[PDB]
């Protein structure tokens, strides 16, 4: 019974979240459905880092532009990108030509650009 109650509560939670229809919540939810998930709690102050998994180039080009990462309705300055082999990836490498040569998924470490 305990597993059914947990399933019911979690399903109701995301039904409630959908009905709220908030842009920031929908962004992190829909990103999570595509495998673009945070690795730590999303901070609201610039004095804390954020780490997010970027599963493929299609997601990368929809959220990243130069040193700026767009996520949770906010801007983040990228500090590090590491590939699936835990090797550092230069931002110049993450282009449309060199993308097949990268080891996806990538993990981006970023600092919040502005307060919430």
């Amino acid at each position: 019974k305990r597993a059914k109650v947990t399933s019911a509560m979690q399903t109701m939670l995301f039904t409630m979240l959908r009905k709220l229809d908030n842009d920031a919540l929908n962004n992190i939810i829909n990103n999570a459905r595509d495998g673009c998930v945070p690795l730590n709690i999303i901070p609201l102050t610039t004095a804390a880092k954020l780490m997010v998994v970027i599963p493929d180039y299609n997601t990368y080009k929809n959220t990243c532009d130069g040193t700026t990462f767009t996520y949770a309705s906010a801007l983040w300055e990228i500090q590090q990108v590491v590939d699936a082999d835990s090797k550092i990836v230069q931002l110049s490498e993450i282009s449309m030509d060199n993308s097949p040569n990268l080891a996806w998924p990538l993990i981006v470490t970023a600092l919040r650009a502005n307060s919430a």
Binding site: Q10, M12, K19, L20, I28, A32, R33, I41, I42, L44
Partner: protein
Amino acid sequence: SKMSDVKCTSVVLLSVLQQLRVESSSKLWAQCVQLHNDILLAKDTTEAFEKMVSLLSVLLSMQGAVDINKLCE
């Protein structure tokens, strides 16, 4: 209205995190409780939603604990 619904959702979210065995003595749990408290005390939706983003991200960061695609079905 949205204000009551957001606060109701934040209570459900903290209960969901509690059942997923987030240790009550951990730093993460104290952060979740503080966010839950701030949402309940919020006076406008902008503050409440920003805090809900942080609180919900705790659930989205727990890999293998929940499959989001099945819950959104």
